[PDB]
């Protein structure tokens, strides 16, 4: 019975060092997460006075309570010895406990009790179904005289884009509103907002977009008002994936554009990098190949071309421009890939002057969120104007992301052949959003032996998979096969007609930058990816499934 | 107002981070000791809920409560964040608190309240004045149905040796009895005893010898019975400091003799190293120059000669013997000095055979407690029989140690020109017993500017000083002068007749091994040592004063 887990504190419970009161084993790594079922609520822990753990200076054995979830939450306490810790009340809806044991000597251990601590706050959450409506604070334009902690999620039928736009925003410890590309703390974070930091319009085709929203009576007046729209799309076949993603049009907001630095005078800001801008452009604080213009596309986007120009100094008529550059991309803005062509990097031939435009279509389309252009050579200085071109992965017909990334596929529908940790969070396998990835028990396994499986929950038309490496000697899958099933019990491998043989799909060349693999549309409730080849570090994988719903007679 | 100190919890009090509730300063090192006036008692602390200290993982700012006194007591708790620690009850009569602040950002801090926690235990302490009597547990031979925590101290008029000898000893966490060469936790520890570890006879001429004695109801039957005697001595002038210290006679107990190792068969134990023993001798487990025979003389003794022999294997008639050796000495068994002759070490020419005895008189007498002989060359193997010769520093006439080592001179009677720590424990200046030593504020001072001073408390005949280096780049004083005074206000330097000039005494050649300096007996209530020269690390010093009481007409 593997120690640790995730407990839903709706019902008060206990957590104790494995043996307790029997002495705890050596070489031990229990971690728990205690969560309340409402954002509203807090967790409270009270320890049993009979508490014994090894002394010294907690160098060796100890208990650690952290505030939130994961090891990078703030440390509420680290204890060891014979004194139980004092009541720990969470500040969020979640707590993380970790027990550590050295390979030498032990003691009785510890027992605590968890339960929901009620603060006074109200859960004002609402789901939004309707074609158009207002999402706002209760009582807006004024203060709702109560704490709040609320989920607003927009849900859209497939083929419908969600447009969210904020009218007023008036709020980072007391108040905040984060926006999620999915279910909160399951989908990726689009961004945390607070203050009068009024957030730019968002267009999501993920099928959900949700806001978590928290307030305090200590903030005198605060609230927000937004509008949402559900606009029908129509996937053409005759459709090129080369539309501009919106530097010139502005569909990419200033908020989304950033850079390593900018000139001291502040007259060559990032927000001037928009293609065809009549006011200078982007230049950094120095000119070196260690510099970059960053655009956050917010949602997982397909990039197919880059177009760049130089810039004429509006105050001096000088002509600055980039002559060549590298491209650097990431799904989360933390893990980065420099675009390759063959073995080594790809140097893009850019401009010959300030005014004229130079286009560069990528070799093949690249799936990402954050984009960095990186100047390598230039004339005079580093000037830059830019458009990005591509389209949505959803613009293909029957090509919806089916829930791994958002959270509409639950943890319960995500299974695997083996897993390396005794007790393994199924959300670890989610494309982009998972903090690490799926690793099997011996991650250097024999091919066709290991697999990850997704239960879509009802029979769907499945048309592709998106495959990604693993974040946390960095594993990714180099080649794989796919089987599908309706019964969960009778399975067909996706066949290759040339070879007459289970088709062997290409995988990733990188632990972060994912790859879309499509195939003839088949009916399936269950899909399985079986790795065949991988990087030297072993199998590490994240996955999403592409497809759409089933639909005549007389 | 320097933060930290020593508080006597007889009256309940408060301790808070300097500013509290004003934010605490950066770069901060407050340490406190909270002590109960009876061994009997425990300390309890309760914290104020309004507790704020910097987070992260207590890497930077924190509070530490340790169980006893000093940094090497067990850690009862280390806290940081916004959660005050839970009640901490001591296990002894003392607690140690330390607050740490980084050079970056702070918070409100902390406040706690201290007071005596009553456990139930009885303080059965007695002082012993009388010529002869029994020191024992209450109710001995049986269990006193109560916890106990008691000081037994023997006090002797000067010129009287104290002899303590134990009849029965029947007791290391629940029960113990430590014996102190002085006032407990002020004088040196002679040794901690517990179990049926029946302690050997002790002869102390220090003027006090005391026992601390602790029991528990969890130990079913325990107690001890001892006898003490006060025997009059008479200091001769015609007296050589060359008496045997008691390997052959046995006045040095087996308990006191030890070694790096011993042969595997257990037939050459340390307890066979007694001079003229008819059963083999001492041999180690290997034969190498990294080996030693150790004798603990218990009290600060004067060593003047070493006599050694070899040994004939009683079971095989072979002849083993040491040919040369080095001598290694320490006042506390932790800090060691290898005896020198001129620059380099002193190799002693020992034996030429097993049977015959070889004497070696030291160059000049050496003041120590722990002695190690260290074989360098030998015939066949390392065999050793041994006598140590010398006498008591007290065997000189009017040469009593006047209280620095024992604690009969109080902290209040110990003053200095400067001191390096803002708030400076006066007991730091005590010969042998002090854990570190007296250091001035800039320990590289201008000569005659700094001084340490001892208020003997009434006008005495002072006849010498004992001077020692400092334990905690190791300071000792190489040359010094001494002034004395009756008024505390009119001061005479001890003059040198040859030079007609304040006499300049030789100091130490070592941070541990002390040196006795005597002089014409003068009347004095106050004595001052003024360092003139020192080691490269600066002034560091410990001191005792030698002398005796004032006494005719018609």
């Amino acid at each position: 019975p593997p120690c640790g887990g995730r407990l839903n504190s709706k019902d008060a419970g206990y957590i104790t060092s494995p043996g307790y009161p029997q002495d705890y084993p050596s070489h031990q790594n229990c971690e728990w997460i205690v969560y309340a079922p409402e954002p509203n609520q807090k967790i409270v822990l009270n320890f049993n006075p009979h508490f014994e753990i090894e002394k010294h200076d907690c160098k060796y054995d100890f208990i650690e309570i952290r505030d939130g979830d994961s090891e990078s939450a703030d440390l509420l306490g680290k204890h060891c010895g014979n004194i139980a810790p004092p009541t720990i009340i969470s500040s969020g809806s979640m707590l993380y406990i970790k027990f550590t044991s050295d390979y030498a000597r032990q003691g009785a251990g510890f027992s605590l009790r968890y339960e929901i601590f009620k603060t006074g706050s109200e859960d004002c959450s609402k789901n939004f179904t309707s074609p158009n409506g207002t999402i706002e604070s209760p009582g807006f334009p004024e203060k709702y005289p109560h704490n709040l902690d609320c989920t607003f999620t927009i849900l859209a039928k497939p083929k419908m884009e969600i447009i969210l736009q904020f009218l007023i925003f008036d709020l980072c410890k007391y108040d905040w509103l984060d926006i999620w590309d999915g279910i909160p703390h399951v989908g990726p974070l689009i961004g945390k907002y607070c203050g009068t930091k009024t957030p730019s319009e968002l267009r999501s085709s993920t099928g959900i977009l949700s806001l978590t929203f928290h307030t305090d009576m200590a903030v005198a007046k605060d609230g927000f008002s937004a509008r949402y729209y559900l606009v029908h799309q129509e996937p053409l076949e005759n459709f090129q994936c080369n539309v501009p993603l919106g530097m010139e049009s502005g569909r990419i907001a200033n908020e989304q554009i950033s850079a390593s630095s900018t000139y001291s005078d502040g007259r060559w800001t990032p927000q001037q990098s928009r293609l065809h801008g009549d006011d200078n452009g982007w230049t950094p604080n120095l000119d070196s190949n260690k510099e970059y213009l960053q655009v956050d596309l917010r949602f997982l986007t397909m990039l197919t071309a880059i177009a760049t120009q130089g810039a004429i100094s509006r105050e001096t008529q000088n002509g600055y421009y980039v002559k060549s550059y590298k491209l650097e991309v990431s799904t989360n803005g933390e893990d980065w890939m420099v675009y390759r062509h063959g073995k080594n990097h790809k140097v893009f031939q850019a401009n010959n002057d300030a005014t004229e435009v130079v286009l560069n279509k990528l070799h093949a389309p690249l799936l990402t969120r954050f984009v960095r252009i990186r100047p390598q050579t230039w004339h005079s200085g580093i000037a830059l104007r830019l458009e990005l071109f591509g389209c949505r992965v959803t613009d293909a017909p029957c090509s919806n992301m089916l829930g791994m990334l958002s959270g509409l596929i639950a943890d319960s529908q995500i299974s695997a052949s083996s897993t390396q940790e005794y007790l393994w969070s199924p959300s670890a396998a989610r494309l982009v959003s998972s903090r690490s990835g799926w690793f099997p028990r011996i991650p250097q396994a024999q091919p066709g032996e290991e697999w990850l499986q997704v239960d879509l929950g009802t029979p769907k038309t499945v048309k592709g998979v998106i495959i990604q490496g693993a974040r946390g000697a960095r594993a990714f899958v180099r080649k794989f096969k796919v089987s599908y099933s309706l019964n969960g019990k009778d399975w067909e491998y996706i066949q290759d007609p040339r070879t007459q043989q289970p088709k062997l799909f290409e995988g990733n060349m990188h632990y972060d930058t994912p790859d879309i693999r499509r195939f003839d549309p088949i009916p399936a409730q269950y899909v399985r990816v079986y790795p065949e080849r991988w990087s030297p570090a072993g199998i590490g994988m994240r996955l999403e499934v592409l497809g759409c719903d089933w639909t005549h007679h007389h | 107002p320097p933060c930290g100190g020593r508080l006597n919890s007889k009256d309940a009090g408060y301790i808070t981070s300097p500013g509290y509730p004003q934010d605490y300063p950066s770069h901060q090192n407050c340490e406190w000791i909270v002590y109960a006036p009876e061994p009997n008692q425990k300390i309890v602390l309760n914290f104020n809920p309004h507790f704020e200290i910097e987070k992260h993982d207590c890497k930077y700012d924190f509070i530490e409560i340790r169980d006893g006194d000093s940094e090497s007591a067990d850690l009862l708790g280390k806290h940081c964040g916004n959660i005050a620690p839970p009640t901490i009850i001591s296990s002894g009569s003392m607690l140690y608190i330390k607050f740490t602040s980084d050079y970056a950002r702070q918070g409100a801090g902390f406040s706690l309240r201290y007071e005596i926690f009553k456990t139930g235990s009885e303080d059965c302490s007695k002082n012993f004045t009388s010529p002869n009597g029994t020191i024992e547990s209450p109710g001995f031979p049986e269990k006193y149905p109560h916890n106990l925590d008691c000081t037994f101290t023997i006090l002797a008029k000067p010129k009287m040796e104290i002899i303590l000898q134990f009849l029965i000893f029947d007791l290391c966490k629940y029960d113990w009895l430590d014996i102190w060469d002085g006032i407990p936790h002020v004088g040196p520890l002679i040794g901690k005893y517990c179990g049926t570890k029946t302690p050997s006879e002790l002869r102390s001429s220090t003027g006090i010898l005391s026992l601390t004695f602790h029991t528990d109801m969890a130990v079913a039957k325990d107690g001890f019975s001892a006898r003490y005697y006060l025997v009059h001595q008479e200091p001769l002038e015609n007296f050589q400091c060359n008496v045997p210290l008691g390997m052959e006679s046995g006045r040095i107990a087996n308990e006191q003799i030890s070694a790096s190792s011993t042969y595997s068969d257990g037939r050459w134990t340390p307890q066979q190293s007694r001079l003229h023993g008819d059963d083999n001798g001492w041999t180690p487990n290997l034969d190498s120059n990294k080996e030693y025979l150790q004798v603990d003389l218990r009290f600060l003794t004067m060593l003047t000669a070493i006599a050694t022999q070899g040994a004939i294997s009683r079971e095989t008639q072979n002849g083993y013997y040491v040919k040369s050796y080095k001598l290694e000495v320490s006042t506390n068994g932790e800090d060691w000095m290898v005896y020198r002759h001129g620059k380099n070490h002193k190799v002693f020419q020992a034996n030429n055979d097993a049977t015959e005895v070889v004497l070696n008189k030291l160059h000049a007498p050496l003041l120590t407690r722990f002695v190690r002989i260290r074989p360098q060359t030998w015939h066949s193997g390392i065999a050793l029989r041994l006598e140590l010769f010398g006498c008591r520093v007290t065997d000189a006439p009017c040469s009593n140690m006047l209280g620095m080592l024992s604690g009969l001179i109080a902290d209040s009677q110990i003053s200095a020109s400067s001191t390096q720590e803002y708030l400076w424990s006066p007991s730091a200046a005590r010969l042998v017993s002090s854990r570190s030593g007296w250091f001035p504020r800039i320990p590289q001072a201008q000569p005659g500017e700094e001084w340490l001073q001892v208020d003997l408390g009434t006008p005495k005949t002072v006849k010498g000083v004992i001077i020692q280096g400092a334990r905690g780049a190791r300071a000792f004083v190489r040359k010094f002068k001494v002034s004395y005074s009756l008024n505390g206000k009119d001061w005479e330097y001890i003059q040198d007749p040859r030079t007609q000039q304040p006499k300049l005494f030789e100091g130490n050649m070592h941070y541990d091994t002390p040196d006795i300096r005597r002089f014409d007996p003068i009347p004095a209530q106050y004595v001052r040592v003024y360092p003139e020269r020192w080691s490269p690390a600066g002034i560091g010093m410990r001191l005792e004063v030698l002398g005796c009481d004032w006494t005719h007409h018609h």
Partner: antibody
Amino acid sequence: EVQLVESGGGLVQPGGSLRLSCAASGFTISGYGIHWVRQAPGKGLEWVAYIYPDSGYTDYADSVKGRFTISADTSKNTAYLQMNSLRAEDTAVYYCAREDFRNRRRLWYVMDYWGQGTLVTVSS
Amino acid sequence: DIQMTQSPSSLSASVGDRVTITCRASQDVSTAVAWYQQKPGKAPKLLIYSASFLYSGVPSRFSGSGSGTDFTLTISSLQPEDFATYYCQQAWAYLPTFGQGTKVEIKR
């Protein structure tokens, strides 16, 4: 000298209420465990409840849970046991006993000192 | 709750006889078992803690063994004053419990 002296026991109407007092002399009760153990006339010892006043940890035998409320006033160095909705079968002598657990894993839930007992009788 | 049951529930035996009370716990209890002695109309007295450790003042003629689910008190040289009722208690679970008790009678 460590002592416990109960008081406040006696005859009481069924359904009625009553409040025992365990009064510590010789030591501070906070930072010990104070247990109540009852003994029905000529029958064995039943553990009923306990308190650890520093923390507040309390707990109760099912036979009394919901009806009894152990508590402690450390300014008065006393522990209480407030019994409500009293049934006949609560009739017994009620001992309070000390548990010394801090630093003593082998003596956890061991009751080293016992009060003299007070008699609670439940009759119409 | 962990239940403790004692064996026998009463015994008579002569002065100087060795005497053996037994206590079986309804599930493993490591050595966490205490023995008390109750004389009639008096509060119980701790005799043994942690299965085998004599508490202060207790005549060494008392001793405890046991190690898991069966435990045993032993009065080696019975005395008149040892007339009493003897309780075992488990000191392991969150909630303590006692045995129903063994009543010792002296045979004269």
